[PDB]
Amino acid sequence: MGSMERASLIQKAKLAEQAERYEDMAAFMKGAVEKGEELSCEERNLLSVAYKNVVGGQRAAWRVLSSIEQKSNGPEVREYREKVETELQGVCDTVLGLLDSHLIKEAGDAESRVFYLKMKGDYYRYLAEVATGDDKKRIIDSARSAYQEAMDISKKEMPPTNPIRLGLALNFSVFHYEIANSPEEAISLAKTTFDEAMADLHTLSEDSYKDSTLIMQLLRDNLTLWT
Template identity: 40%
Template sequence: MPCKFCSKPYSSAGSTLDVVKQIKSIVDHFGPQLSTEERSLLSIAYKNITNTLRNSWRIVDTLHKVQSTRKGPVHLIQRQRQRIETELIGVCKDIIRLLDRELLPAASEGEETVFYSKLKGDYCRYLAELGQKRERDRYAELSLKAYRSAYKHALATLHPLHPTRLGLALNFSVFYHDIKQSPERACHLAKSAFDDAVLSVNASDPGMDQTLRDSMAILQLLKDDIILWSGEMKD
């Protein structure tokens, strides 16, 4: 699909930052009603940026913990970890501002609202992973509120096999496991979404074939997490 702003096809050669700037330009010039492809590009661009930073942060944080046990100099590692944290926090807050000010207020009922609310829950969750206690608690609450709103809307408007509904269930259950430290609630939510999707397969119409194929990978991830978290509860 051509870009509204430049009237040319999107190019995969551009950097993720270029994609973010281009989507923001579309919002500024044409309004916040993005196409499905534009929403996907925005999500992938921010995900690529934050995944790189989160992986780097985990590596540096592990090095910091190892070095601390050896009572060696850690100031350089601390400085690098702080630099990554600052950049990651800035990116997360940037997309949350875009969602709150532009995209969510203009979102249509159904998949679009669920998609944006899920994104807000995701990036508030990332901030909750990083912050000190007060900030961590604040962003955990914002993440929970966004996920709950998205899930309530998804149950009312989206088919149980819809990839956006399943992706939301996957990330919401991860929130309960990682942030709330509750494998029981995480497993319950994941299993409920998985069972609803499986039960709806026979009732789906022929037009759901493509959706079913798109959803299979998420169903497998849900199944893997259910097995993992069930094992944790037994332990």
């Protein structure tokens, strides 16, 4: 996207979102990142929404095919699951490459740095979901380390009701439960996160209250499923 203006890439990412063209949206936001400038709050959200949708479709397809493949145990189902898996890994690697070159190193504010590090944990978590071989353990540790660094910053620099802090804790708790085989850590994190946010709600405006309680309900839904 080197010949298109940064502002035009951003404009077209917003159009692609409205058109539910998430692959285009991701390519436009990839082009915007590669312009080399830091991203605003809104632009970070566009980048995140685009790739979450793209990899979300790939994960859903991979799960369908992995399920069929396990019920079967010709080479077609395995071959096609492998194809989808490779395409998913390529998208995760692309996002991780954007964070590494050079979004994270240039992110100094807590809101941007926690946002990108949560992203890094998420896309390593997606890699871990399909990993088996010699690097599954290393991929899991890469996810844990990104989430942990993001947690440490958010606890120091953000209020307990901050939606990024809450969504980070939500996804790290899912990491603990689904990836790290640590359901007690998952439940403890979600419950402490929920309780500390509840006690901070009195400080918020009506609109911030709606934003925070929405994500607290997601924590509560998980706790209900897990206990």
